[PDB]
């Protein structure tokens, strides 16, 4: 049943590791905190309802004031490739792992409080989170974890009258960030190249134990997790590319040991679609531009399987990353052919996907919106409306003629089936850049009734939902 704040078990497993790993670091409070949003799915994952996010002493824990007596947190040291130039020491500068709850299922579930205070990461930050900042991480957390794509998990963003300047006056928020590993690909670089090969065992075996445990009765344990590791990275990748999210910091501390999308900052869901789209102003080569994360994505696994040389052979290392390109093709094909309304795999539906993407390219064709109103109407229908948004408009025709074509080259179902199978698959809501935006507007003058309702939205992005046809609009 759903419990109370006090009633909640901790079993602190990577505090036990010692202080090589993390240091302990208690948070620094921020004044008059508010609850601004909460996520019901997000807190179901630590047996709490809603109802107990509504409480004073639920905001002053997860704004640094009090703390569980059971917790215990730390601060984590990583390093990492930063956008390709290797960073000898980063780590935990703005977060901190409050301690890890065993919930009623046997599951052990991170509590990191970003946003928490100084660290002695931190360097020359302040160790604070804004709430824009905080906002954006918690709605794309629960966003992309409804739309199916793993992601980081986000419980609630606590809001606070403590200034923080970027480039203005803004003011400091903490998110509550819930995932089963804060470990990162360089979490094992930093022991990696450190030479610390004692620790670097440690917790490649803490990963391998609690995380890839089938793994350790091969001969090869570390190797087999590494294939896992590689095929979970093809998966996210694929969904990633399918749905047109941007993450625009790959760098290989912000890649998830278990596959998930981490480290929420500069993202944007596509609009229009483009590409090559740089979604971060700082990306200034598009080094993390969308179609890039592909390449990017085995590029850090490449770095990953690097500190595992001292366990696997370089050539099993580099057979295992070549497994990723096929892989990701497998999966993001799957997910395309399903967005159109396909059941069946055949030879050239790679070119059929590749092409309506080219035609999308130049003509401002809203990516969400073509695959929703694809399944809406019968396909001869929906791509009579279609036409008009090409700019390449009888290319465009003979794509739809390609198109109908393939529909019919399988049994595809009734007209109501296969609009039922499409919009189960292809979102009328999306967390678009423009969306967000307003929600943190509304929630920097202190209205949260905004931000409350685009995450609700987005709890079933796949279902309409009455007077919410606001959200489901292109960008103005
Ligand atoms: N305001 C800040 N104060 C202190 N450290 C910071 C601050 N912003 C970023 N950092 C650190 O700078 C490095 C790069 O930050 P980044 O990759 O954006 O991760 P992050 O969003 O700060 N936290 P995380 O989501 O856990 O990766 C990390 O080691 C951060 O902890
Ligand atoms: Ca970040
Ligand atoms: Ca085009
Ligand atoms: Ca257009
Ligand atoms: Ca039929
Ligand atoms: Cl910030
Ligand atoms: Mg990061």
Redesign the pocket.
Known sequence: SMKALDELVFDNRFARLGDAFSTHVLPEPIDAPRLVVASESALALLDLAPEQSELPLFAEIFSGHKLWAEAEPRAMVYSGHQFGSYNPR??????LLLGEVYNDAGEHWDL?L?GAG?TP???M?????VLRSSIREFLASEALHALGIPSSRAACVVSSNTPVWREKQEYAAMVLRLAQS?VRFGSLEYLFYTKQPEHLKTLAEHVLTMHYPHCQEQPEPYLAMFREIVERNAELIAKWQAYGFCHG?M?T??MSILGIT??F?PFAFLDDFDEHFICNHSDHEGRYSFSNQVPIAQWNLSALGQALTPFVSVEALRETIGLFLPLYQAHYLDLMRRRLGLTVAQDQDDKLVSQLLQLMQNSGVDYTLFFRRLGDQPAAQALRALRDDFVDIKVFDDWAQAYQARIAAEENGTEQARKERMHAVNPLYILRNYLAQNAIEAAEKGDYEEVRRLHQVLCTPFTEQPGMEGYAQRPP
């Open positions: 980063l780590g935990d500068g703005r977060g990191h970003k100084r990461y931190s360097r930050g302040d160790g604070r989170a804060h910091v760098n501390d912000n981490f480290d900052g």
